[PDB]
Amino acid sequence: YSYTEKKRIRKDFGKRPQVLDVPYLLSIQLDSFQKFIEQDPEGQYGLEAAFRSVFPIQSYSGNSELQYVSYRLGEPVFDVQECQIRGVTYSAPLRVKLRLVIYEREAPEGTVKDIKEQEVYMGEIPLMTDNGTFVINGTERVIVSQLHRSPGVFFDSDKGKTHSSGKVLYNARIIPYRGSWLDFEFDPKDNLFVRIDRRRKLPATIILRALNYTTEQILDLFFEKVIFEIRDNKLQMELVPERLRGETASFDIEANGKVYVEKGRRITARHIRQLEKDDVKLIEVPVEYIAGKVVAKDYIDESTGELICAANMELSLDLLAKLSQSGHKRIETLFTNDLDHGPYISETLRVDPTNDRLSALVEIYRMMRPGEPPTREAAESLFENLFFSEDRYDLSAVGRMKFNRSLLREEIEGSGILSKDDIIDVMKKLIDIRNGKGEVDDIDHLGNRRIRSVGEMAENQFRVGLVRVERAVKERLSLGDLDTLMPQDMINAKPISAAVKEFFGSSQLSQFMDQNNPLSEITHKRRISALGPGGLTRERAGFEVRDVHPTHYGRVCPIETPEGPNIGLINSLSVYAQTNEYGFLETPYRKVTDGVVTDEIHYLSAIEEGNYVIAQANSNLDEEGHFVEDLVTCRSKGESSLFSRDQVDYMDVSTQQVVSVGASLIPFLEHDDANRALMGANMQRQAVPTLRADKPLVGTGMERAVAVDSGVTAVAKRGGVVQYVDASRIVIKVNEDEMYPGEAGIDIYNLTKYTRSNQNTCINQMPCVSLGEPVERGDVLADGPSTDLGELALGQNMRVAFMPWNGYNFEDSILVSERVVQEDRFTTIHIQELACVSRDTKLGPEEITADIPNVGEAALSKLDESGIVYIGAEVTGGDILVGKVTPKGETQLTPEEKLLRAIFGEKASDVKDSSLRVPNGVSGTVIDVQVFTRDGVEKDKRALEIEEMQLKQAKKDLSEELQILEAGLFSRIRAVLVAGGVEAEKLDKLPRDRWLELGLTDEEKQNQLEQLAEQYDELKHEFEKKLEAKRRKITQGDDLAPGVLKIVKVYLAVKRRIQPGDKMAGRHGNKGVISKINPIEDMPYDENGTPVDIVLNPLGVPSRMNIGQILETHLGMAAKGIGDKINAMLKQQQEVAKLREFIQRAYDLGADVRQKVDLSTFSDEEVMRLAENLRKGMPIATPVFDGAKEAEIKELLKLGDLPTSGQIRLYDGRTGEQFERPVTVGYMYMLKLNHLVDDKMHARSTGSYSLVTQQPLGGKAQFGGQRFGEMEVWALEAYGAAYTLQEMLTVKSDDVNGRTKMYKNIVDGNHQMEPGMPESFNVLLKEIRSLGINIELEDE
Amino acid sequence: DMIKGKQGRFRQNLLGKRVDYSGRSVITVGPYLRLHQCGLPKKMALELFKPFIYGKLELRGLATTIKAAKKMVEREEAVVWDILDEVIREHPVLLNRAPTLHRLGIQAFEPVLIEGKAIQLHPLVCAAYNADFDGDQMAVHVPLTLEAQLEARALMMSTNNILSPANGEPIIVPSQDVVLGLYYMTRDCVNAKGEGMVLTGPKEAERLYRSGLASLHARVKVRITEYEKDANGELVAKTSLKDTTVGRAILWMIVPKGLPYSIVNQALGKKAISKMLNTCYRILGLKPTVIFADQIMYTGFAYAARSGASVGIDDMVIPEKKHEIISEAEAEVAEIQEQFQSGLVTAGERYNKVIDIWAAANDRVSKAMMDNLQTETVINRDGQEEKQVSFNSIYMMADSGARGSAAQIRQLAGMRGLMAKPDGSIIETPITANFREGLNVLQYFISTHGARKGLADTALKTANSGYLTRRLVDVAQDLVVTEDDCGTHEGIMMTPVIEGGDVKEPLRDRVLGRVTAEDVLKPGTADILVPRNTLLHEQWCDLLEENSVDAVKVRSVVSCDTDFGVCAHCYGRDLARGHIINKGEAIGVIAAQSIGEPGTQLTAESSIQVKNKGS
DNA sequence: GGGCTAATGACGGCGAATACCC
RNA sequence: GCGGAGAGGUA
DNA sequence: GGGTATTCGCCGTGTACCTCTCCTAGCCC
Ligand SMILES: Nc1ccn([C@@H]2O[C@H](COP(=O)(O)CP(=O)(O)OP(=O)(O)O)[C@@H](O)[C@H]2O)c(=O)n1
Ligand SMILES: [Mg+2]
Ligand SMILES: [Zn+2]
């Protein structure tokens, strides 16, 4: 085991051996943005692709080309932490190499001039942190992956609602990644219509017309010909027998001398077989049969030239006669089988008004840009750029792959632009499916839904910036002169940086990290949103869309999704799933070699999964990959059933791969109803870090994966030995193995102490390790918020008892014992940030001085001379948070008053105070203060203290590193000095600085001393410049917004204890409000005298079918019972032997388990340490579906000497009498959710009112009243309550004179009223009157 | 845009204002409360009643001027809290819960100052509010003027609203803990401590139970004196020896005089308690019903706590014969599938056969489980054994109607039946495992789909409901009861709707509280049974039951003759109160609300078969 | 900073405005 | 610093 | 021309509450 694992091992249930280990959980974001930057030669995914797509930018036929060489990412000026501190965006400057080339128009293309620009700067691009987030203005943002329809072609049905007479009308939609959309649809009259992206529906053939195809060419390409020969008389037809399938006979079908089908009897299969075996090709046919068909080609009179019948004209006897007399021997008709093969292109051609190419382009232009007269070349260019311009229309590699796969072409790699064959094949497939030789696609299939991660979306936005700047540069290069300008006046960075910061900051998919819990962060980063750009709106989306499709298996979590209005549109991604090369979703599976289940894993996407029969992970395999059962349970086409052993192609990797991380953390998921599991996961993501997080007694084993993969822990990069431990930094001396040969030094990890998270919670790291302990790469040095020794501790595990306790746990409410507040276990630290900004007004700049007009010295007492609160001062609502003064101008004081001002010291400049005050009703301690000045602003005292505090630390760190390197260099100088005449008595006792001034015999040794002296000088000079750089960064004004002189931020930290009304929850979907704090004595207690902590209502179990909490309680009681026994055996300190025996018998516990804990490592110390950590209760790991069965829980309870049934007899702490029917007690892992009553609670008597409609403000920040809505009005009307409603409508909110008169009347001790007319009604009159509508209040 | 639309105007600022003297907070249990009161945090109460505080402070002379009163409130000295207690005394406050579906979403209570930041809500009223203590919040308004105070305490107070305005039945019925406690109290057991001893009354029954000399449920002979108002409002004591449980006696202590003992004598589940409250209301009246409901709550909570009912993994018993049933059904499905591969039955027919056999197997396992769980306590009397309705905690939770239905019991201990795939088609293999056992990926996945679809349904359902109820309350708002009697003879002949097999809804409930259009005659002419328009109260309905009236013509609101409103008689009585409608009541809005609010849970014929022997 | 100028993923219902069929 | 968008969450 | 379909376009789509960022913009003097 690893060292952090050897510290405290977690007893893992679970029978099947894990073949694949959980991947890096944040793989999506990091890998996508890495792919985004990724300097790579061949243009694949990556910024490179965008540049080559948009560049080269050629003038409007001006012969001045612009070429792109390569780009470089500058080194970020600000690291992540400091960037968050200073409130700037963490980003990298982007520099691109360009060349301007100017040629000669009048000569064969040849470069006259080429100038190469010194890596022109084209704006800033934000970088992603190591953990996968973005700092955009000193706030951590996450870019959630987006689920959306993949480019390609889709054939939908849209039935049921078509005129309510059946008539299922099909449609083919071609959707590109970039470019306009194409749509082919039908109509009630089976005419197939095309509709450019979202316009009116035109006859489809026009696009075919636009493609330069003549009517005969089209009818050739689509319909199967039928030949009518005339030989010596009367119309003989070439017939393919198999074509007759299912056709009532219209004529007498005679052949080879014998009538086969009588005229009128429908062709039966017997007749079809007869004709097929006879090999009948041609038969003479009566003219009545042809009297109905349609003509394919446009048969002209070849002799004279006059046209007779046109292409796709219905045939009449007279036309047949004219054809026969004209001399046409071969007639090509159409095959219109009203059952299978319909006249669809024919009828579309009939409705199609356009004839020529030009008329088609004109109709197209009048569709795209209605109203402006179309000019020929405008239409030509429009149509060219629509679907065939490389720049505007690009499907993708993915789009093309899906397109070719849908139309059954072997070739995967195509051209981006929509070629004509593509469109023709699409229409062919549409009419094919319309005949019934094909299936429609289901949008909800994950094989049709693609995931756009960060890098892809960033690339799109960056391309958008490029298209902006390209148009701009285009115009500037066309109009302006060619040779004068150098390649930096020409290129503007503003649109690129504008687009990028717009996307990252103000976008639907770019959202705040839900950052109060490690689970919250990790789950937020691995999210798949169906909203955002080109995404369905949540309100519009139907219930059918938001359901969970069988394809989601092992790719998206079926159970973790917000239960709010956008249910089903969020879908957190499952544990093991990945994104394909093309952006699809794939899950690992184990290969099956016909008999043996091998160990090589293949990742399969949705479509590939669809074909095969996949076995489940929880299938019994014995020692050689063989199934124990003859018929095993699998799924083949989205439906599960039983298949034979020698049929399974793959098998699930592990039970967890179905569910997300959040759901994977819930123990005994297999016993919880899906609804309550859903709510449990969603809530569990809201837990707030407590003061000392400990661990779940009942976990799933995934805790370490989540904690490590989240960035909240501090993890070693190069393994070594812990040299120095402090509650701010851990300094480790590297091991020689991992030690770099040249310029290695040691590793130093600076920790972060209480800072503000997005949700205002505290983010503090504690050290785990001690001095002198060896650490390896990837161990957990320091615990982040709500994590312990590497494990996820979302909340805390307490002893609960399921029983109704005098209806104080009546509904989902929860009862809690005073011991819980006494032990200080649900107290969280929160942290508010406040900002006072001093800008520069034109009447004069505001000041931060402590001299504030007409404030008592009481308010200043807690302020320093600079005017900022002291760090550590306790404040309350209304106290002055920071001092600011508002300037006063045009004072125009009287001359005697001016003389009075001079003696008194009164300041005409002040007289008004803009000082920030602590908000009403919030009280805490000021833990930190920051000050940001712009250029030309003097540093305040606070600025000096904060700068010195950061600097002295930096100095210390540099000094420590330098001192180690100096000690090494001095040791080496001593090792050379010992050679060439040993001197050890005098040397070691004189100071070290008296070693450079000493000398030695002139030799090579003196040359080495000179070498080392110059190396010493070089280390000094590098140290000094690095120091200077650090000092320049510390001192510099931290660039503020235009107009702002300086800003002062103050952090308050507040310790919130649990109190009645707060919301508490479990992991299984059980919720509640803490209703009462009971004294310790009142709480139930078992015979032994230990009281319970929470008394939980049983009635929440049967109707809310979450049984996982009951098993969790039982197993948790078992684990805490064993832990209690080990604490008891340990307090008496029996001997190592007993402890090792007991712990081994516990860790083994039966068989078939994949644990294997030898306990051999470190015979004495490490075992004693591990016992010390388990004395508080041995942590279990039940995986989600490969969990602990009841019998195992019974065994574990027995090992602890506890009742096997998991229920105990309890004594009523108030009365002392026993409860009948023993009750379930045991430890369950409960969470305190972020919904704290003190944040929710709110009341107002009178306060500020709104501007336009003089009603009181809405909200909690500003006092704000409750909204007496229309439903409440109706409630009052249902009663006869006229006066209450009246006052509620006028005196309470809207009537100004009424409200003040009522205040005065109430104060007077009288209770009457004077309702008047609401001001909002008068506003209404004024607004309606602002239209041309006269609305008057009449009188008579 | 500013005028039209929800967010803009009329809806937002002219029917949806934002009052003063209002607050919001999380709701909490507070069992000790009276039906007509609510726990209110000190600090919100002070904030709300600020101007009252100033007025009273100035009247008492504690403050010279209003600013000194403000400063005294901002320090919050003991005098301020004393004045707040004194002013709060009879002042009622309005409690509201975010989705005010019907008029019981707003009710008035007398506040009691408490510590904490959460509002305490009386348990019995939660059903009216649809309130749950899992983070639900409530708003609290203060009526200012004297008419508003009187209106809040009279029309809106919790105790004045015990009957639903939609139908006449009680709204405040005990919900889950109360009913569980009462159920535990009344159920009897074959043998316990103190079997068959004779008690002189309930008081010594309590003496015995609280001292541990008798079980809370144990069959016993007790002498009891019930009261009956058989005469013209006088109570006559009848005193005899009944065979009951200790628990039933303990419960009888609360019951007011007028009620028959029989009421408590039974198992006393949800329905039994509800009809208990019903009879108490119909016989005695409002105030005794209120006090009796409070007593019921207290005793139920207390004895539920004394019961110690919990839920262990073993409380849900896997039927012993499950594995056999499942293996048999699997063999049968295998035979039918093989007999399909040979081609004697279509695919659809095979589907139907499998689905029906699986449904039958599900019913078999369910019935086996119910037999196992239901009556499994084979406990012994003095000698031989006997069997009885078990005391399995989950079973008591099922049968009492506190939580859970038979379906969920099935879902815990049996096989959890068939599921529907997205399109509505039913999967061939069911989920044989249950939550006591563990499902595997497929069965879970399927149930996940089910729950997901359910949730999305509830969301869209709520939106549609809200819209429908808005239209209803909107259309019928102006209708008011303006006249006492229009005097028309028109009316609708109302019959009981007997859809096919039996009487889905009887006459008595359909006609109760409607005035008659004309006198109806016995089956023999000139035998008038009901004078011209009379309100048909319970007594008339029972009288009609004694006779054999089948169809009754009653005056309806639709045919009412009154101009610009309706008349009291054409409408009838039905209300949260019992009496004929009062002139002035806005019946349109009450009707619209009553039709709208419940709208959130809304989603062969070869031979005729006579059900009962008749002509 | 100051001065000057200004696209594509709902759906149902209903009633009016053409399209067309005798 | 009254407002309105976007995102998320609660019942 | 007159009645009937069909396209077409507008109008609606639950309440109460709680967090956060972001808010006129671009070019020239
Ligand atoms: N989208 C939403 C979701 C919820 N709500 C509100 O949350 C409650 C749902 O209760 P409910 O009946 O659905 C669950 P509960 O009452 O606790 O009983 P149970 O758990 O034993 O089944 C209702 O008051 C709804 O108004 C809403 O307004 N809009
Ligand atoms: Mg609730
Ligand atoms: Zn009437």
Phi-psi region of A638 (alpha: psi -120 to 50; beta: other; left: phi over 0): left
CA A1116 – CA B88 distance, rounded (Å):
48
Residues with a CB atom less than 6 Å from ligand 1: A 1103-1104; B 99, 130, 132, 459, 462
Q: Which of B361, B346, B363 is nearest to B407 (CA)?
A: B363
List, in order, residues 6 or more apart from A477 with CB less than 8 Å away.
A57, A59, A62, A64, A66, A490
Residue ranges in A132-196 assigned as alpha helix (H): none
Local structure of residue A1115 (DSSP, 8 states): H
Q: Which of B226, B182, B184, B218 is nearest to B201 (CA)?
A: B226
CA A533 – CA A903 distance, rounded (Å):
67
Tokens of A859: 């308010």
Task: Name the nucleotide with the smallest C1'–CA separation from A536.
Answer: C9
CA B578 – CA B285 distance, rounded (Å):
10
Q: CA of A533 vs C1' of E25, distance in Å?
A: 24
Helix B441-475 × helix B587-596 angle, to 10°: 170
CB contact under 8 A, A565 and B459: yes
Atom of ligand 1 nearest to the CA of A811: 17
List, in order, residues 6 or more apart from B196 with CB less than 8 Å away.
B219, B220, B221
Q: Which residue on chain B is closest to A1100 by alpha carbon?
A: B403
CA A234 – CA A289 distance, rounded (Å):
12
Residue pair A1038/A943 in contact (Cβ under 8 Å)? The answer is: no
Q: Which of A921, A1130, A968, A956 is nearest to A1030 (CA)?
A: A956
Query: Phi and psi dihedrals of A821, rounded to 5?
Result: -75, -35
DSSP string of A573-616, one letter each residue: B-SS-EE-TTS-EEEEEEEE-SSSEEEEEEEEEHHHHHHS-EE-
Atom of ligand 1 nearest to the CA of A564: 1
A56 cis-preceded (ω within 30 degrees of 0): yes
Q: CA of B6 vs C1' of E11, distance in Å?
A: 13
* Residues with CB in 5 Å of ion ligand 3: B 486, 560, 562, 567, 570
Buried-exposed string A737-775: b where 16+ CB fall within 10 A, e elsewhere: eeeeeeeeebbebebbebbbbbbbbbbbbbbbbeeeeeb
Helix A1190-1199 × helix A1136-1148 angle, to 10°: 170
Local structure of residue A1060 (DSSP, 8 states): T
CA B258 – CA B283 distance, rounded (Å):
7
Rg of chain B over Cα atoms, rounded to whole angstroms, equals: 30
CA A96 – CA A73 distance, rounded (Å):
9
Pairing of strands B481-483, B566-567: parallel
Of A568, A658, A1268, the CB nearest to B19: A1268
Tokens of B154: 């009279």
Helix, coil or strand: residue A793? coil
CA A162 – CA A995 distance, rounded (Å):
98
What CATH superfamily is the domain B321-453?
A: RNA polymerase Rpb1 funnel domain (1.10.132.30)
Of A568, A1099, A1110, the CB nearest to B452: A568
Q: Which A residues, 562 through 591, put their C-beta within 8 Å of a C-beta on chain B?
A: 563, 565, 567-568
CA A723 – CA A781 distance, rounded (Å):
12
CB contact under 8 A, B51 and A1243: no
Atom of ligand 1 nearest to the CA of A812: 17
Helix, strand, coil percent content, chain A, rounded in steps of 5: 30, 20, 45
H, E, C per residue of B206-263: HHHHHCCCCCCCCEEEEEEEEEECCCCCCCEEEEEEEEEEHHHHHHHCCCCCCCCHHH
The amino acid at residue A521 is E
CA B544 – CA B520 distance, rounded (Å):
10
Helix B286-307 × helix B270-283 angle, to 10°: 160
Helix, coil or strand: residue B61? coil
Q: Find the distance separating the first CA and the last CA of chain B, reported in whole Å.
A: 67
List, in order, residues 6 or more apart from A1039 with CB less than 8 Å away.
A88, A934
Buried-exposed string B278-301: b where 16+ CB fall within 10 A, e elsewhere: bebbebbeeebbbbbbbebbbbbb
DSSP string of A614-678, one letter each residue: EE-SSS-B-SSS-BSSSEEEEESSS-EEEEEGGG--EEES-GGGGS-HHHHTSTTGGGB-HHHHH
Task: Provide the residue count of chain A.
Answer: 1340
Local structure of residue A467 (DSSP, 8 states): H
Indicate which residue's Cα is closest to atom 14 of ligand 1.
B132
> For a pocket test of ligand 1, which of B27, B130, B460 has the largest count of ligand atoms closer than 8 A to its C-beta?
B130
List, in order, residues 6 or more apart from A1194 with CB less than 8 Å away.
A1204
Local structure of residue A356 (DSSP, 8 states): S
Strand D–CB A1079 distance below 7 A: no
Indicate which residue's Cα is closest to atom 6 of ligand 1.
B99
DSSP string of A951-1003, one letter each residue: HHHHHHHHHHHHHHHHHHHHHHHHHHHHTTS---HHHHHS-GGGGTS----SS
CB contact under 8 A, A1281 and B181: no
Measure CA A70 to chain center. Answer: 31
Chain B: nearest CA to A269, how far in angstroms?
Answer: 22
Which experimental approach was used here?
A: cryo-EM
Query: Of all helices (H) and strands (E), which one includes residue A1010?
Result: helix A1004-1035
Resolution of the solved structure (Å): 3.3
Q: Which A residues, 128 through 147, put their C-beta within 8 Å of a C-beta on chain B?
A: none
Chain B: nearest CA to A442, how far in angstroms?
Answer: 12
Residue pair A155/A430 in contact (Cβ under 8 Å)? The answer is: yes
Q: Find the distance separating the first CA and the last CA of chain A, reported in whole Å.
A: 95
Strand D–CB A686 distance below 7 A: yes
